[PDB]
Design a protein around this ligand. Structure first.
Ligand SMILES: *[C@@H]1O[C@H](CO)[C@@H](O[C@@H]2O[C@H](CO)[C@@H](O)[C@H](O)[C@H]2NC(C)=O)[C@H](O)[C@H]1NC(C)=O
Ligand SMILES: *[C@@H]1O[C@H](CO)[C@@H](O[C@@H]2O[C@H](CO)[C@@H](O)[C@H](O)[C@H]2NC(C)=O)[C@H](O)[C@H]1NC(C)=O
Ligand SMILES: *[C@@H]1O[C@H](CO)[C@@H](O[C@@H]2O[C@H](CO)[C@@H](O)[C@H](O)[C@H]2NC(C)=O)[C@H](O)[C@H]1NC(C)=O
Ligand SMILES: *[C@@H]1O[C@H](CO)[C@@H](O)[C@H](O)[C@H]1NC(C)=O
Ligand SMILES: *[C@@H]1O[C@H](CO)[C@@H](O)[C@H](O)[C@H]1NC(C)=O
Ligand SMILES: *[C@@H]1O[C@H](CO)[C@@H](O)[C@H](O)[C@H]1NC(C)=O
Ligand SMILES: *[C@@H]1O[C@H](CO)[C@@H](O)[C@H](O)[C@H]1NC(C)=O
Ligand SMILES: *[C@@H]1O[C@H](CO)[C@@H](O)[C@H](O)[C@H]1NC(C)=O
Ligand SMILES: *[C@@H]1O[C@H](CO)[C@@H](O)[C@H](O)[C@H]1NC(C)=O
Lengths: 48, 164, 216, 323
């Protein structure tokens, strides 16, 4: 996270003071697909 | 990264106390952005929220002094990352100091960092000024007996480079 | 002499100027780099779009060049206007200081810098001006018992200029911004009211210039 | 504002296209940072002109003038004078909604509690030390002997105050009281502040709502254009989003620059008053407010400052033949 500051500053000598360099976007662990409770296809009505 | 009954979105799903009307589907917000949702398989009111986001900020003394830097993650809670939690965000690599000195490298919300003590970048609540209490009583006056003449440079722009 | 030592090693005190020169060349640079950007068109070289394609297509592409570059100007231009006004207000402030501080003596407080102001010496600097403010700052203080008034015969005596003080015995009237005690006589003090009303009046004797002058 | 995110949400497809507009994304941050930096320079210039933090003496005897109104309240957890609380209630979701898309609100460098220490100092030195604390080391002077000078400043000989002190005390105090209700009973006095806060939150709403506009593209959801259409064509679509949105930032940015340049002008007006009016005594007619000016009391207000100008207004006339 330090070397990025030199690229943003565009100077091998980064003078004192705070520099905004990059941004971090927390990536999501996994996907939730939550379709409602209960159709069903009538394979118990066709096959039985 | 969630999909609810065709509604897609990525956020932090939490329990929430806001109470829908039964027929409703999405809660929303002033920005029309999706805010609260209702879990279809069992009806419950889930909030939503942004990821940590914020900007990274590299607090450094001059590269002439040190190559050491203290990273400030802005406006986050310290999980998703020597760590310290601030008002302005998650700070890393600067040892907190209960002492309070002049603001040196301004960070946010009063937190100001400086390099000195071996040495390590520190972070501390900025003291605004040194403290004084005037010794005051209704008959008490203090009249200067002697003076200095100081020459204080003051610098102002006048014109800027003309172009066409 | 302190000024010249400061400048000898101070890059920062000119930060105001150095920033202004920077920010222009900055936006000037960025203005130039925008000539290398595709802007969605197939290349950022004007002719290399032409000689690649038959012009009735180039008429389409050169839009995305022009639409890009023309915008990038209006960005840069609208910047300058805003930045110009920023200098504009600063230039007005410089005229105000040049007028009031240097050509006058500014009664305004901390307009010419901390302390009471004596005079300023302007000094040119690239795209700017530098004033040297000569200001009068008091130094050494001494706690004094004071009183807003002095009874004499039952008349009240108030200072014309300055205040009644004492080091604890002899009441002295002195000018305010410097300690210069003087014995209290009618030429120092004017009479108003009487001894009831003032809050803090003390009991003392205001010497008279004239009374001794008589006695012969 | 995060330019790459605000324009292209969570899409490298869009993110790559943005690179073809070059430095727009970066120069916007360079622009807004210039604003964001000097904001804490404004608040710096205005409030902290004083070298040290003075604090009022333990016991208050000013000759009858009652400053418990304007002095820091020792019993509040955040010590702020009784008046300042009236202000922070008047001035005032947008809390995270903006913060969804990369619109961030950075904390002002100086916490409000710090602002209230400055405006305590400036107000502590003004009361005890007269005007000398702006010119150097503060000099304790009896407050009633301060007001003898501030009359000489306006041409009223000091023998008026030493005789009218009790009266002037009540007029002062009873004047301070009505300042409460002037603020307490009407919410339009703070409009100046309230307008600033609104216009900021205004454009942000507008800036957000621009995300939902088609701009000629088939939809305002950046992924739908990617979902429905094969890229070859979706490229041209996303342009109309980017070109639209990327423009829509420059609109917002330019507004902020212009609007900040107004505040930058208003800040100097404060820093001028704070220096001349509060720290000194102003000879400039109606710069400190109508009437001959005696002294001013700074009071903080959200993203602003409020001065209480104690002024000298003559009253009763008697026609006199003159020569
Ligand atoms: C306060 O100042 C007065 C003015 O000088 C002092 O009075 C003189 O004190 C010196 C002491 O060395 C004597 O020699 C003079 O005869 C005094 N003159 C008069 C007119 O009184 C006084 O002593 C000082 N007191 C204190 C406490 O500092
Ligand atoms: C100054 O002198 C006056 C007298 O000229 C004092 O006034 C009287 O003081 C005595 C006590 O010493 C009281 O008993 C009297 O009642 C006072 N006068 C009246 C009419 O009541 C005065 O106290 C002395 N001190 C000051 C005022 O500085
Ligand atoms: C200054 O004014 C405040 C109120 O404006 C005074 O505080 C009041 O004191 C009386 C005591 O007689 C109480 O009954 C009130 O409840 C108090 N009000 C508040 C709001 O605290 C204070 O005493 C005054 N002090 C001086 C020195 O004038
Ligand atoms: C900065 O570094 C250079 C070497 O690169 C050195 O000569 C100079 O003394 C340094 N100055 C400060 C202020 O650290
Ligand atoms: C961080 O999270 C902890 C619990 O996980 C909570 O107690 C704390 O208030 C949070 N702080 C912020 C700033 O979100
Ligand atoms: C400050 O003091 C508290 C105890 O009052 C302690 O818990 C904390 O660790 C100290 N901070 C540092 C940086 O040592
Ligand atoms: C005046 O009295 C105060 C009382 O605390 C003291 O601190 C101060 O040093 C005194 N003045 C001088 C010049 O010593
Ligand atoms: C000044 O204050 C003291 C309290 O320390 C008091 O005894 C004295 O009477 C007061 N004098 C005046 C003139 O207010
Ligand atoms: C002075 O005389 C004029 C004559 O018209 C009058 O208007 C004014 O009220 C008089 N002043 C007073 C104090 O009565």
């Amino acid at each position: 996270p330090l070397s990025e500051t030199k690229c943003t500053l565009k100077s091998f000598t980064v003078e004192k003071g705070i520099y905004q360099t990059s941004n971090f976007r927390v990536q999501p662990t996994e996907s939730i697909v939550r379709f409602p409770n209960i159709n069903l296809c009538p394979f118990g009505e066709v096959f039985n | 990264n969630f999909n609810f009954n065709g509604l897609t979105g990525t956020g932090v799903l939490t329990e929430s106390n806001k109470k829908f009307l039964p027929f409703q589907q999405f809660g929303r917000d002033i920005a029309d952005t999706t805010d609260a949702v209702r879990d279809p398989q069992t009806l419950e009111i889930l909030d939503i929220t942004p990821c940590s986001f914020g900007g990274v900020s590299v607090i450094t003394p001059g590269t002439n002094t040190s190559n050491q830097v203290a990273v400030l993650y802005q406006d986050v809670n310290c999980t998703e990352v020597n760590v310290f939690q601030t008002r302005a965000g998650c700070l890393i690599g600067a040892e907190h100091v209960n002492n309070s000195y002049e603001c040196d490298i301004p960070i946010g919300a009063g937190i100001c960092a400086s390099y000195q003590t071996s040495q390590s970048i520190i972070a501390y609540t900025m003291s605004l000024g040194a403290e004084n209490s005037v010794a005051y009583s209704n008959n008490s006056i203090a009249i200067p007996t002697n003076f200095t003449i100081s020459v204080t440079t003051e610098i102002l722009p006048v014109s800027m480079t003309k172009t066409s | 002499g302190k000024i010249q030592d400061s400048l000898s090693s101070t890059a920062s005190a000119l930060g105001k100027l150095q920033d202004v020169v920077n920010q222009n060349a900055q936006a000037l640079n960025t203005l130039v780099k925008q000539l290398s950007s595709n802007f969605g068109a197939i290349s950022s070289v004007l002719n290399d779009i032409l000689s690649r394609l038959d012009k009735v297509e180039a008429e389409v592409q050169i839009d995305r060049l022009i639409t890009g570059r023309l915008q990038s100007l209006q960005t840069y231009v609208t910047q300058q206007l805003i930045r110009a006004a920023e200098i504009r207000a600063s230039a007005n402030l410089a005229a105000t200081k040049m007028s009031e501080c240097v050509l006058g003596q500014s009664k305004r407080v901390d307009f010419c810098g901390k302390g009471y102001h004596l005079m300023s010496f302007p000094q040119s600097a690239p795209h700017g001006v530098v004033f040297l403010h000569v200001t009068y700052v008091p130094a050494q203080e001494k706690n004094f018992t004071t009183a807003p008034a002095i009874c004499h015969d039952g008349k009240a005596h108030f200072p014309r200029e300055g205040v009644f003080v004492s080091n604890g015995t002899h009441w002295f009237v002195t000018q305010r911004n410097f300690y210069e005690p003087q014995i209290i006589t009618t030429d120092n003090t004017f009479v108003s009211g009487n001894c009831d009303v003032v809050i803090g009046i003390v009991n003392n004797t205001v010497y008279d210039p004239l009374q001794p002058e008589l006695d012969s | 504002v995060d330019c790459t995110m605000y324009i292209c949400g969570d899409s490298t497809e869009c993110s790559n296209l943005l690179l073809q507009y070059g430095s727009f994304c970066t120069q916007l941050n360079r622009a807004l940072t210039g604003i964001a930096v000097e904001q804490d320079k404004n608040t710096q210039e205005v409030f902290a002109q004083v070298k040290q933090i003075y604090k009022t003496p333990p016991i208050k005897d000013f000759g009858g003038f009652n400053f418990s109104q304007i002095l820091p309240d020792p019993s509040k957890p955040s010590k702020r004078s009784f008046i300042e609380d009236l202000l922070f209630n008047k001035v005032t979701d947008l809390i995270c909604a903006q913060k969804f898309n990369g619109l961030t609100v950075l904390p002002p460098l100086l916490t409000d509690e710090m602002i209230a220490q400055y405006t305590s100092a400036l107000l502590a030195g003004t009361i005890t030390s007269g005007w000398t604390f702006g010119a150097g080391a503060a000099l304790q002077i009896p407050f009633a002997m301060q007001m003898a000078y501030r009359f000489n400043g306006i041409g009223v000989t000091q023998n008026v105050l030493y005789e009218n002190q009790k009266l002037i005390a009540n007029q002062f105090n009873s004047a301070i009281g009505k300042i409460q209700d002037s603020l307490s009973s009407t919410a339009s006095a703070l409009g100046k502040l309230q307008d600033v806060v609104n216009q900021n939150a205004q454009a942000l709403n507008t800036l957000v709502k621009q995300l939902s506009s088609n701009f000629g593209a088939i939809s305002s959801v950046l992924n739908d254009i990617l979902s429905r259409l094969d890229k070859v064509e979706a490229e041209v679509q996303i342009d109309r989003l980017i070109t639209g949105r990327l423009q829509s930032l420059q609109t917002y940015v330019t507004q902020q620059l212009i609007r900040a340049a107004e505040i930058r002008a208003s800040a100097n007006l404060a820093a001028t008053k704070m220096s001349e009016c509060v720290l000194g005594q102003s000879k400039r007619v109606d710069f400190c407010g109508k009437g001959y000016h005696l002294m001013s009391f700074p009071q903080s207000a959200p993203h602003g400052v409020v001065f209480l100008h104690v002024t000298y207004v003559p009253a009763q006339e008697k026609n006199f033949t003159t020569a």
